[PDB]
Amino acid sequence: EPPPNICEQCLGDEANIRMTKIPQGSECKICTLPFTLYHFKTSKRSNNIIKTLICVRCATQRNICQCCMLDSRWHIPIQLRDHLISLVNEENVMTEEAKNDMMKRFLSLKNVKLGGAQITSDPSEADNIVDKLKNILLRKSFFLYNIDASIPEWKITDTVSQLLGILSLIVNHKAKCGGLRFQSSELGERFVSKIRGVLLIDRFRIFIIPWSSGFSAASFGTNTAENIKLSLSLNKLIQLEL
């Protein structure tokens, strides 16, 4: 009858926390075996009830807690800590998650710490991979050019909102082009005052155009074979700028 893994973030900033154990509560959300489920409240007057959703063996197989489903030592997701261990050891340590029911039960009952659980288990190799991490970190409408595919729409909204004081937006990523739209007459005048000027989001340069046409998404292209062709022609137009 092992006591649960619940880390310091799920329980919260209290010293006296009253949880409720139900023996054989529910099937765990990894292996669908029943287990003793502990549900509680972070405060006494919390509106959210927080319960363990995995069993103890599935918790210790991933070295994770049972409530917030992040690492016991680091409080981070399983996939990303496996990615960080792959960045350190040059070995693709991945968590082999099952998909068949019998495979889920089989993969939980065995005595092993799978995935990247063994590294963060003892604190010695934890701090070893931590200072290896330190060694790694020692080593009224407008048109928009020059939007590489790693530039989302929400960053294009956020930087234009930050340069102003706070309006919709339409970006064709397969055409690699952008557009902005609003209603206020003075807002376009203030957008001209706060500058084909350049938007600098993260040093990635986006050229602006006062677009007197009322663009729809059809103006960026009607099909996908038009989008890549217009993106190539507009990159050649950017080379004509340069």
Binding site: S43, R45, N47
Partner: protein, 156 residues
């Protein structure tokens, strides 16, 4: 209430003077017994809170006429106790000190709560505002579960 039988006595004098109030409570219970649409669960429990409110107000009315105003005699009050127009126990808790205003019998039992304490509606509203000020948030309690009373301690 309880059905009128041969073994039940006729009412003592003065009962026909208070029949319109008890009859209003009776016809409101007749309306509130029928099932509504009642699809949700938060508004399924409210149509039990209406019946707990009607039973509380009927017993409060009989308590008010007997103990507070002294208009109903002991014979008529004992007849209204026999015919189950009002609980002995709710009126008895209203006789006690500290339980003068009270929601229902369920919300003073420490036997039914998971913590072994009374219900949250017995906490005063000022104490809930003090703990809301000490935590920083608002008062995170609005409506009690067993009965719909927002706050039913003897002060508030």
């Amino acid at each position: 209430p309880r059905i009128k039988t041969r073994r039940s006595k006729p009412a003592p004098d003065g009962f026909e003077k208070i029949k319109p109030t008890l009859t209003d409570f009776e016809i409101q219970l007749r309306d509130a017994q029928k099932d509504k649409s009642s699809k949700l669960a938060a508004k399924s429990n409210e149509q039990l809170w209406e019946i707990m409110q009607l039973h509380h107000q009927r017993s409060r009315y009989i308590y008010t006429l007997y103990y507070k105003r002294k208009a109903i005699s002991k014979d008529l009050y004992d007849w209204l106790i026999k015919e189950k127009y009002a609980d002995k126990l709710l009126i008895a808790k209203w006789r006690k000190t500290g339980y003068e205003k009270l929601c229902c019998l369920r919300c003073i039992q420490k036997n039914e709560t998971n913590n072994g304490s009374t219900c949250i509606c017995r906490v005063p509203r000022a104490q809930l505002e003090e703990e809301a000020r000490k935590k920083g948030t608002q008062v995170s309690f609005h409506q009690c579960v067993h009965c719909g009373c927002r706050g039913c301690a003897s002060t508030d």
